[PDB]
Design an enzyme around this catalytic site. Sequence first.
Site, PDB file in Angstrom:
ATOM      1  N   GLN A  16       0.796  -1.204   0.000  1.00  0.00           N
ATOM      2  CA  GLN A  16       0.000   0.000   0.000  1.00  0.00           C
ATOM      3  C   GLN A  16       0.831   1.257   0.000  1.00  0.00           C
ATOM      4  OE1 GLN A  16      -0.537   0.734   4.637  1.00  0.00           O
ATOM      5  NE2 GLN A  16      -1.749  -1.058   4.075  1.00  0.00           N
ATOM      6  N   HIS A  21       4.519  11.499  -6.116  1.00  0.00           N
ATOM      7  CA  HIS A  21       3.319  11.102  -6.868  1.00  0.00           C
ATOM      8  C   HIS A  21       3.114   9.613  -6.835  1.00  0.00           C
ATOM      9  CE1 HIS A  21       6.762  11.220  -9.816  1.00  0.00           C
ATOM     10  NE2 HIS A  21       6.310  10.022 -10.194  1.00  0.00           N
ATOM     11  N   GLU A  48       1.015  10.484 -12.030  1.00  0.00           N
ATOM     12  CA  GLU A  48       1.654  10.338 -13.325  1.00  0.00           C
ATOM     13  C   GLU A  48       0.846   9.346 -14.196  1.00  0.00           C
ATOM     14  OE1 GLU A  48       5.900   9.734 -13.095  1.00  0.00           O
ATOM     15  OE2 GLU A  48       5.796   8.433 -14.865  1.00  0.00           O
ATOM     16  N   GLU A  63      -4.239   3.413  -0.054  1.00  0.00           N
ATOM     17  CA  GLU A  63      -4.948   3.536   1.207  1.00  0.00           C
ATOM     18  C   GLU A  63      -5.229   5.024   1.422  1.00  0.00           C
ATOM     19  OE1 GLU A  63      -2.688   2.344   4.654  1.00  0.00           O
ATOM     20  OE2 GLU A  63      -4.118   3.280   6.027  1.00  0.00           O
TER      21      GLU A  63
HETATM   22  C1  LIG Z   1       5.489  19.126 -14.378  1.00  0.00           C
HETATM   23  O1  LIG Z   1       6.521  18.662 -13.493  1.00  0.00           O
HETATM   24  C2  LIG Z   1       6.451  17.240 -13.306  1.00  0.00           C
HETATM   25  C3  LIG Z   1       7.745  16.726 -12.641  1.00  0.00           C
HETATM   26  C4  LIG Z   1       9.003  16.848 -13.540  1.00  0.00           C
HETATM   27  N1  LIG Z   1       8.927  15.892 -14.669  1.00  0.00           N
HETATM   28  C5  LIG Z   1       8.592  16.205 -15.920  1.00  0.00           C
HETATM   29  C6  LIG Z   1       8.587  15.086 -16.647  1.00  0.00           C
HETATM   30  C7  LIG Z   1       8.943  14.066 -15.855  1.00  0.00           C
HETATM   31  C8  LIG Z   1       9.043  12.685 -16.063  1.00  0.00           C
HETATM   32  C9  LIG Z   1       9.481  11.890 -14.998  1.00  0.00           C
HETATM   33  C10 LIG Z   1       9.561  10.497 -15.122  1.00  0.00           C
HETATM   34  C11 LIG Z   1      10.229   9.845 -16.157  1.00  0.00           C
HETATM   35  C12 LIG Z   1      10.296   8.429 -16.227  1.00  0.00           C
HETATM   36  C13 LIG Z   1      10.980   7.787 -17.290  1.00  0.00           C
HETATM   37  C14 LIG Z   1      11.070   8.389 -18.559  1.00  0.00           C
HETATM   38  C15 LIG Z   1      11.716   7.710 -19.608  1.00  0.00           C
HETATM   39  C16 LIG Z   1      12.287   6.446 -19.404  1.00  0.00           C
HETATM   40  C17 LIG Z   1      12.234   5.849 -18.145  1.00  0.00           C
HETATM   41  C18 LIG Z   1      11.583   6.527 -17.099  1.00  0.00           C
HETATM   42  C19 LIG Z   1       9.590   7.675 -15.272  1.00  0.00           C
HETATM   43  C20 LIG Z   1       8.902   8.315 -14.229  1.00  0.00           C
HETATM   44  O2  LIG Z   1       8.301   7.700 -13.323  1.00  0.00           O
HETATM   45  N2  LIG Z   1       8.901   9.714 -14.151  1.00  0.00           N
HETATM   46  O3  LIG Z   1       8.222  10.268 -13.055  1.00  0.00           O
HETATM   47  C21 LIG Z   1       9.649  12.478 -13.738  1.00  0.00           C
HETATM   48  N3  LIG Z   1       9.471  13.785 -13.544  1.00  0.00           N
HETATM   49  C22 LIG Z   1       9.133  14.584 -14.576  1.00  0.00           C
HETATM   50  C1  LIG Z   2       2.605   4.962  14.455  1.00  0.00           C
HETATM   51  O1  LIG Z   2       1.422   5.737  14.268  1.00  0.00           O
HETATM   52  C2  LIG Z   2       0.772   5.345  13.035  1.00  0.00           C
HETATM   53  C3  LIG Z   2      -0.538   6.131  12.870  1.00  0.00           C
HETATM   54  C4  LIG Z   2      -1.673   5.639  13.794  1.00  0.00           C
HETATM   55  N1  LIG Z   2      -1.851   4.165  13.748  1.00  0.00           N
HETATM   56  C5  LIG Z   2      -1.604   3.325  14.758  1.00  0.00           C
HETATM   57  C6  LIG Z   2      -1.879   2.075  14.349  1.00  0.00           C
HETATM   58  C7  LIG Z   2      -2.317   2.130  13.083  1.00  0.00           C
HETATM   59  C8  LIG Z   2      -2.770   1.159  12.179  1.00  0.00           C
HETATM   60  C9  LIG Z   2      -3.223   1.586  10.924  1.00  0.00           C
HETATM   61  C10 LIG Z   2      -3.636   0.682   9.933  1.00  0.00           C
HETATM   62  C11 LIG Z   2      -4.596  -0.314  10.178  1.00  0.00           C
HETATM   63  C12 LIG Z   2      -4.993  -1.209   9.165  1.00  0.00           C
HETATM   64  C13 LIG Z   2      -5.975  -2.201   9.441  1.00  0.00           C
HETATM   65  C14 LIG Z   2      -6.105  -2.765  10.729  1.00  0.00           C
HETATM   66  C15 LIG Z   2      -7.058  -3.761  10.993  1.00  0.00           C
HETATM   67  C16 LIG Z   2      -7.906  -4.189   9.967  1.00  0.00           C
HETATM   68  C17 LIG Z   2      -7.801  -3.642   8.684  1.00  0.00           C
HETATM   69  C18 LIG Z   2      -6.858  -2.629   8.436  1.00  0.00           C
HETATM   70  C19 LIG Z   2      -4.404  -1.085   7.882  1.00  0.00           C
HETATM   71  C20 LIG Z   2      -3.412  -0.113   7.645  1.00  0.00           C
HETATM   72  O2  LIG Z   2      -2.845   0.022   6.553  1.00  0.00           O
HETATM   73  N2  LIG Z   2      -3.061   0.779   8.640  1.00  0.00           N
HETATM   74  O3  LIG Z   2      -2.119   1.782   8.322  1.00  0.00           O
HETATM   75  C21 LIG Z   2      -3.138   2.949  10.609  1.00  0.00           C
HETATM   76  N3  LIG Z   2      -2.723   3.859  11.479  1.00  0.00           N
HETATM   77  C22 LIG Z   2      -2.331   3.479  12.710  1.00  0.00           C
HETATM   78 ZN   LIG Z   3       7.329   8.711 -11.601  1.00  0.00          ZN
HETATM   79 ZN   LIG Z   4      -1.476   1.738   6.087  1.00  0.00          ZN
END
Ligand SMILES: COCCCn1ccc2cc(-c3cc(-c4ccccc4)cc(=O)n3O)cnc21
Ligand SMILES: COCCCn1ccc2cc(-c3cc(-c4ccccc4)cc(=O)n3O)cnc21
Ligand SMILES: [Zn+2]
Ligand SMILES: [Zn+2]
Lengths: 176, 176
Positions: free
Chosen positions: A26, A119, A165, A92
């Site tokens: 998650q 993102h 993205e 989540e």
């Molecule tokens: C408007 O401002 C946005 C944030 C700045 N920004 C602009 C384009 C761009 C692409 C990537 C990017 C490229 C790629 C990538 C591109 C080509 C080949 C392999 C990976 C993967 C990916 O997850 N991301 O996020 C990350 N930041 C980017």
């Molecule tokens: C250290 O402080 C953390 C922030 C407060 N906090 C404490 C315990 C806890 C559990 C979950 C939680 C419960 C569960 C959950 C628990 C029981 C049944 C189903 C889902 C899923 C999950 O992803 N999360 O994050 C979310 N916030 C939690």
């Molecule tokens: Zn990215």
């Molecule tokens: Zn969680």
Amino acid sequence: GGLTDEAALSCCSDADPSTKDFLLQQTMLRVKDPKKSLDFYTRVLGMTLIQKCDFPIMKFSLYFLAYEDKNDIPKEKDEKIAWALSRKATLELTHNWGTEDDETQSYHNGNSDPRGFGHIGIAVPDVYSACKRFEELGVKFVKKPDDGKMKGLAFIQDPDGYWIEILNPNKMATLM
Amino acid sequence: GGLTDEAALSCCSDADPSTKDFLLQQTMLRVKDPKKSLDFYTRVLGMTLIQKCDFPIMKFSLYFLAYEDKNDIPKEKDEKIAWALSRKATLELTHNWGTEDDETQSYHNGNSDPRGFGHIGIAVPDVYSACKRFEELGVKFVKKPDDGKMKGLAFIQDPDGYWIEILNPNKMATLM
Ligand SMILES: COCCCn1ccc2cc(-c3cc(-c4ccccc4)cc(=O)n3O)cnc21
Ligand SMILES: COCCCn1ccc2cc(-c3cc(-c4ccccc4)cc(=O)n3O)cnc21
Ligand SMILES: [Zn+2]
Ligand SMILES: [Zn+2]
């Protein structure tokens, strides 16, 4: 300015066998208004709400969204939690009760100071057709596919302003 | 208060057919020092570095980490990018060149004002054995498995301080 490929690999260790069944389950984002977020993630992005968890003493709810078939959701409540929380790649959304009614409240998207999270990203078959549909639906853009040098990749934003993205993995290599 | 299950469902829509093949591909986090982050995600968490991309004019590197078998990584560069960018549940680490040498720079984990993103979460077969090994490796803990109200659920931190939930989908706490 950054690491070479070989220097980066020098920092990588092979996966320890005790971690062989670990999965990246998650990504948690806090959302101001869950009604608006659920509408966006399901209607606009096509995700499915797979699990809703409420915590009355902590005053929050958790909404688990994923690209899963709703017909795969188990009937039994205990089997349902074990299934939803064992899905890879879920989003989540945390709703802290009352934020939707507080004018002074808003979450930070991590893309301006103080920066951190950037993102989530959705892989799609066609960035251009997906984005044409997003424009038709009034989605707010951060980067349209043909704006900037990195053509064919887009960024949109959700109701809280988190960046999403939009990428086509089969057309990324030509950007290098 | 929170939404009822019925009120949440009324905010949801079935998936438009044009989104049927969309997948949640990545979660991006900015990292101050890629050497420390790569060591943590591969040696401690057992993820694999599946792709590294450098952008000389953008002045950054992107590192894609995933729970994938390193033997499934394709040999050729363009095939490698298309395969890595089509894996579900990847973690993208962005290294803005020079942050590692800036003593006054640090990223924000979203868990203190201003809040937003909260954490990534790893599903494991057993939270206790996973955390015993994390302790042996000197990992920093936000919440040990049996600390506080919710037993058998932990939160650790990466080198930038991002929170990582450690959960066992088969042994979650009972909901009220
Ligand atoms: C408007 O401002 C946005 C944030 C700045 N920004 C602009 C384009 C761009 C692409 C990537 C990017 C490229 C790629 C990538 C591109 C080509 C080949 C392999 C990976 C993967 C990916 O997850 N991301 O996020 C990350 N930041 C980017
Ligand atoms: C250290 O402080 C953390 C922030 C407060 N906090 C404490 C315990 C806890 C559990 C979950 C939680 C419960 C569960 C959950 C628990 C029981 C049944 C189903 C889902 C899923 C999950 O992803 N999360 O994050 C979310 N916030 C939690
Ligand atoms: Zn990215
Ligand atoms: Zn969680």
